[PDB]
Motif scaffolding. Structure first.
Motif, PDB file in Angstrom:
ATOM      1  N   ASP B 117      12.346  13.037  -0.254  1.00  0.00           N
ATOM      2  CA  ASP B 117      12.878  14.022   0.681  1.00  0.00           C
ATOM      3  C   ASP B 117      12.822  15.444   0.114  1.00  0.00           C
ATOM      4  OD1 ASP B 117      14.148  15.205   2.857  1.00  0.00           O
ATOM      5  OD2 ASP B 117      16.156  14.612   2.201  1.00  0.00           O
ATOM      6  N   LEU B 118      12.115  16.340   0.806  1.00  0.00           N
ATOM      7  CA  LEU B 118      11.935  17.730   0.361  1.00  0.00           C
ATOM      8  C   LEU B 118      12.518  18.747   1.347  1.00  0.00           C
ATOM      9  CD1 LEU B 118       8.244  17.694  -1.037  1.00  0.00           C
ATOM     10  CD2 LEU B 118      10.359  17.808  -2.350  1.00  0.00           C
ATOM     11  N   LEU B 119      13.020  19.862   0.826  1.00  0.00           N
ATOM     12  CA  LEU B 119      13.624  20.884   1.670  1.00  0.00           C
ATOM     13  C   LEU B 119      13.098  22.264   1.288  1.00  0.00           C
ATOM     14  CD1 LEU B 119      15.744  20.701   3.987  1.00  0.00           C
ATOM     15  CD2 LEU B 119      17.411  21.601   2.357  1.00  0.00           C
ATOM     16  N   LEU B 120      12.315  22.854   2.186  1.00  0.00           N
ATOM     17  CA  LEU B 120      11.667  24.136   1.941  1.00  0.00           C
ATOM     18  C   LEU B 120      12.512  25.296   2.470  1.00  0.00           C
ATOM     19  CD1 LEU B 120       9.326  22.059   1.552  1.00  0.00           C
ATOM     20  CD2 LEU B 120       7.821  23.688   2.656  1.00  0.00           C
ATOM     21  N   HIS B 121      12.583  26.373   1.693  1.00  0.00           N
ATOM     22  CA  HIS B 121      13.352  27.552   2.082  1.00  0.00           C
ATOM     23  C   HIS B 121      12.728  28.211   3.305  1.00  0.00           C
ATOM     24  CE1 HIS B 121      16.370  30.456   1.906  1.00  0.00           C
ATOM     25  NE2 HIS B 121      16.129  31.064   0.752  1.00  0.00           N
ATOM     26  N   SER B 122      13.572  28.782   4.153  1.00  0.00           N
ATOM     27  CA  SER B 122      13.105  29.460   5.350  1.00  0.00           C
ATOM     28  C   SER B 122      12.447  30.815   5.064  1.00  0.00           C
ATOM     29  CB  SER B 122      14.263  29.649   6.325  1.00  0.00           C
ATOM     30  OG  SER B 122      15.210  30.553   5.792  1.00  0.00           O
ATOM     31  N   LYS B 123      12.894  31.504   4.017  1.00  0.00           N
ATOM     32  CA  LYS B 123      12.369  32.835   3.690  1.00  0.00           C
ATOM     33  C   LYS B 123      11.499  32.863   2.432  1.00  0.00           C
ATOM     34  CE  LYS B 123      15.853  35.740   5.925  1.00  0.00           C
ATOM     35  NZ  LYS B 123      16.657  34.652   6.545  1.00  0.00           N
ATOM     36  N   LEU B 128      11.641  25.571  -2.953  1.00  0.00           N
ATOM     37  CA  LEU B 128      12.030  24.332  -2.276  1.00  0.00           C
ATOM     38  C   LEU B 128      12.870  23.377  -3.140  1.00  0.00           C
ATOM     39  CD1 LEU B 128       9.100  21.814  -2.153  1.00  0.00           C
ATOM     40  CD2 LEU B 128       8.931  23.952  -3.390  1.00  0.00           C
ATOM     41  N   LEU B 129      13.453  22.373  -2.495  1.00  0.00           N
ATOM     42  CA  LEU B 129      14.262  21.380  -3.193  1.00  0.00           C
ATOM     43  C   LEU B 129      13.717  19.968  -2.993  1.00  0.00           C
ATOM     44  CD1 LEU B 129      17.951  22.668  -2.727  1.00  0.00           C
ATOM     45  CD2 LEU B 129      16.317  22.991  -4.633  1.00  0.00           C
ATOM     46  N   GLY B 130      13.971  19.090  -3.960  1.00  0.00           N
ATOM     47  CA  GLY B 130      13.478  17.723  -3.906  1.00  0.00           C
ATOM     48  C   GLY B 130      14.523  16.676  -4.248  1.00  0.00           C
ATOM     49  N   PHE B 131      14.417  15.495  -3.644  1.00  0.00           N
ATOM     50  CA  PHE B 131      15.422  14.454  -3.835  1.00  0.00           C
ATOM     51  C   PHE B 131      14.828  13.050  -3.991  1.00  0.00           C
ATOM     52  CE2 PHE B 131      18.838  11.588  -2.275  1.00  0.00           C
ATOM     53  CZ  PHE B 131      19.785  11.862  -3.235  1.00  0.00           C
ATOM     54  N   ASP B 132      15.224  12.378  -5.069  1.00  0.00           N
ATOM     55  CA  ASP B 132      14.778  11.022  -5.381  1.00  0.00           C
ATOM     56  C   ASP B 132      15.872  10.040  -4.946  1.00  0.00           C
ATOM     57  OD1 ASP B 132      13.170   8.994  -6.350  1.00  0.00           O
ATOM     58  OD2 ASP B 132      13.197   9.668  -8.452  1.00  0.00           O
ATOM     59  N   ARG B 133      15.736   9.480  -3.747  1.00  0.00           N
ATOM     60  CA  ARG B 133      16.808   8.680  -3.140  1.00  0.00           C
ATOM     61  C   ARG B 133      17.080   7.341  -3.828  1.00  0.00           C
ATOM     62  NH1 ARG B 133      15.759   9.569   3.389  1.00  0.00           N
ATOM     63  NH2 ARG B 133      16.004  11.856   3.352  1.00  0.00           N
ATOM     64  N   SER B 134      16.015   6.612  -4.137  1.00  0.00           N
ATOM     65  CA  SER B 134      16.140   5.307  -4.773  1.00  0.00           C
ATOM     66  C   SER B 134      16.101   5.445  -6.289  1.00  0.00           C
ATOM     67  CB  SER B 134      15.038   4.358  -4.298  1.00  0.00           C
ATOM     68  OG  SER B 134      13.813   4.643  -4.947  1.00  0.00           O
ATOM     69  N   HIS B 135      16.564   6.589  -6.775  1.00  0.00           N
ATOM     70  CA  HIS B 135      16.775   6.778  -8.199  1.00  0.00           C
ATOM     71  C   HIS B 135      18.267   6.632  -8.465  1.00  0.00           C
ATOM     72  CE1 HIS B 135      17.071   8.715 -12.139  1.00  0.00           C
ATOM     73  NE2 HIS B 135      15.762   8.578 -12.248  1.00  0.00           N
ATOM     74  N   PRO B 136      18.630   5.793  -9.453  1.00  0.00           N
ATOM     75  CA  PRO B 136      20.019   5.434  -9.769  1.00  0.00           C
ATOM     76  C   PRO B 136      20.929   6.646  -9.973  1.00  0.00           C
ATOM     77  CG  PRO B 136      18.495   4.885 -11.567  1.00  0.00           C
ATOM     78  CD  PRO B 136      17.680   5.121 -10.352  1.00  0.00           C
TER      79      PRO B 136
END
Ligand SMILES: *[C@@H]1O[C@H](CO)[C@@H](O)[C@H](O)[C@H]1NC(C)=O
Ligand SMILES: *[C@@H]1O[C@H](CO)[C@@H](O)[C@H](O)[C@H]1NC(C)=O
Ligand SMILES: *[C@@H]1O[C@H](CO)[C@@H](O)[C@H](O)[C@H]1NC(C)=O
Ligand SMILES: *[C@@H]1O[C@H](CO)[C@@H](O)[C@H](O)[C@H]1NC(C)=O
Lengths: 7, 561
Positions: B117-123, B128-136
């Motif tokens: 899951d990634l989240l890119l800045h609007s400006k 951007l930000l990143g997320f490892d969901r199935s990481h403990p």
């Protein structure tokens, strides 16, 4: 076939 | 002919899921991800001639030589700041592909984490930000070079988001970090959590957190023994008073605009109610609501919806007009032109294109929405449609009577809902273009090759045959903003079955000519039910066959009546 999405 | 088929593209593709993006800055770029339901495989396509032709670019998504193995794209992301750039995350491998030039050139990059899951800045296009969901650990990652290099900025995170300009300073980040209670505490940093001075707790031990414009929301759990929290303009969060005799179990924010908030409240009894802030007065009770918990949990939906929601539609371009579904056992629709100040029954149309219906008798127009549709198995059916590009224009699927029947039709109002007409007998896909100037519909169910369209707000319809052979149709869409007069028909040919098909229909010649001032009127929702208080819109008069341009800029005038 199922669906189409925006985004 | 009034309508041209600008392009017919038979992707030789059997994936069930199709995700489409319009770069849409007058760039004729369109990106398409074909994949599996949520993944075994994928193929990415791209058009530069606005869907006239599509280039399959899946082979450009590789891990280089010495590694032939095929990639699988879970999701692709766009920059809200720069439409030229995109990112493609692999589903299984910790790998990316970045693009700065409309996918003419891609670069394979390795990353420390899986790009769940990634989240890119609007400006800040490079940020951007990143997320490892199935990481403990539930690690959160940041990149400054648009995904080429990464650093980890937090662990054990439940949720997160960027700040909202101008309210929050640049680089602001909100997160929920997991507590051993299993609850979470909401943080806010501008130093990307490298500074305690700029790190700042905003709530403690909270069940859930939601950021909405000026407001912030969160559910605090208070366990007493003897047998929600709100921010406004970022002023510290304090619990809101509720006028009830019954206990409250679940909270849900239905709509957020400054000064008035709509919140669904579901009680122990599984009755759900609607409140309005400015301190929450009661607006409406027994509103169709779902939570996983849940109010409607027992039933079908659980396998379709993991996140709670309600049958509560805000008419988009407006302020104050909403449409909700009421339930007892048994569904009915109610409309308010005030922000929950008063509610009403939806007056059925006067004809068929005639029919008898009366509020005193007990019957009113009833519109099927997201929730009620799943219950009657209307999986692919359309929710209520309203867009800011066409103020006071509403198209919906529903029934006339005392209850939402299985039988449903298409109903249209260019009156913000105050007055309806019966447009189409069956259920249809529908959408619109040219700032509401033109409405297209296509029949659901049996395969068709008919594109019904209308230029006078559904009063009359004409048929355009878009294909020599009838095809199954899976969707009818426009570039968002609905300014163009191009409509995309998604579908598949008859057997051999399920080969994706993208028809690009061009309907300018139905409109014919550029509109002049003669085809414009002033109109406020005040005019419809009042006068009452306003915002005044310039609208093309319904019977005007012409087009406001793609560069139409609707003039809205706000005034103290
Ligand atoms: C291909 O690349 C990915 C990551 O770069 C790697 O995990 C995978 O092992 C490679 N392919 C093979 C044959 O293992
Ligand atoms: C619920 O339905 C019953 C009959 O089905 C009716 O008598 C009652 O008035 C309804 N309650 C509400 C709140 O409308
Ligand atoms: C679509 O068709 C209209 C009329 O045929 C034409 O004016 C317009 O340039 C076309 N637009 C596109 C995107 O092809
Ligand atoms: C209209 O009146 C409101 C309060 O009555 C005021 O806040 C606002 O400034 C006024 N609009 C304009 C354009 O001055």
């Amino acid at each position: 076939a199922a669906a189409a999405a925006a985004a | 002919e009034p309508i041209k088929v600008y392009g017919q593209v038979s992707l030789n593709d059997s994936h069930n899921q199709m995700v489409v993006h319009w770069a849409g800055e007058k760039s004729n770029v369109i990106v398409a991800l074909a994949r599996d339901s949520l993944p075994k495989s994928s193929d990415v396509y791209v058009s530069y001639d606005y869907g006239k032709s599509f280039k399959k670019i899946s082979d450009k998504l590789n891990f280089g030589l010495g590694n032939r193995s095929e990639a699988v794209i879970a999701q692709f992301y766009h920059s809200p700041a720069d439409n030229k750039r995109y990112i493609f995350a692999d589903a299984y491998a910790q790998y990316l592909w970045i693009t700065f030039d409309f996918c003419n050139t891609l670069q394979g990059f390795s990353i420390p984490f899986r790009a769940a899951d990634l989240l890119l800045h609007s400006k800040a296009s490079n940020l951007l930000l990143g997320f490892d969901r199935s990481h403990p650990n539930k690690q959160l990652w940041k990149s400054d070079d648009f995904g080429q290099t990464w650093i980890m900025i937090q662990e054990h995170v439940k949720s997160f988001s960027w700040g909202i300009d101008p309210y929050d300073k640049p680089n602001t980040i909100y997160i929920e970090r997991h507590e051993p209670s299993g609850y979470s505490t909401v943080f806010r940093s501008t130093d990307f959590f490298q500074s305690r001075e700029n790190q700042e707790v905003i709530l403690e031990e909270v069940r859930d957190f939601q950021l909405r414009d000026k407001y912030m929301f969160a559910t605090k759990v208070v366990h007493l023994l003897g047998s929600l929290w709100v921010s406004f303009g970022r002023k510290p969060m304090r619990a809101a008073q509720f006028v009830t005799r019954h206990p409250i179990n679940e909270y849900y924010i239905a709509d957020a605009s400054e000064d008035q908030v709509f919140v669904c409240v579901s009680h122990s009894n599984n009755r759900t109610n609607l409140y309005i802030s400015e301190k929450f007065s009661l607006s409406l009770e027994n509103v169709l609501y779902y939570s996983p918990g849940g109010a409607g949990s027992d039933t079908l939906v659980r396998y379709f919806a993991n996140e709670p929601f309600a049958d509560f539609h805000r008419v988009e371009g407006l302020q104050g007009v909403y449409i909700a579904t009421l339930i007892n056992g048994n569904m009915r629709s109610v409309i308010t032109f005030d922000k929950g100040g008063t509610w009403e029954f939806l007056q059925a149309p006067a004809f068929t294109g005639k029919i008898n219906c009366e509020l005193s008798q007990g019957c009113s127009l009833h519109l099927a929405q997201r929730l009620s549709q799943l219950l009657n198995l209307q999986l692919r059916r359309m929710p209520i449609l309203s867009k800011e590009s066409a103020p006071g224009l509403i198209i919906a699927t529903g029934s006339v009577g005392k209850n939402l029947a299985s039988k449903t039709n298409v109903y249209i109002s260019s009156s913000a809902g105050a007055r309806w007409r019966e447009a189409l007998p069956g259920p249809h896909y529908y959408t619109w273009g040219d700032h509401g100037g033109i409405i297209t519909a296509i029949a659901q169910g049996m395969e068709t090759n008919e594109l019904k369209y209308s230029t006078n707000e559904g009063e009359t319809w004409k048929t355009f045959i878009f294909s020599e052979k009838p095809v199954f149709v899976y969707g009818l869409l426009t570039e968002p903003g609905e300014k163009s007069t191009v409509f995309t028909i998604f579908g598949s040919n008859k057997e051999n079955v399920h080969s994706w098909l993208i028809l690009q229909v061009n309907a300018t010649d139905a409109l014919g000519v550029p509109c002049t001032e003669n085809d414009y009127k002033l109109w406020s929702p005040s005019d419809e039910r009042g006068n009452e208080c306003k915002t005044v819109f310039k609208r093309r008069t319904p019977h005007a066959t012409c087009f406001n341009g793609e560069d139409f800029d609707r003039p809205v005038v706000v005034s103290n009546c």
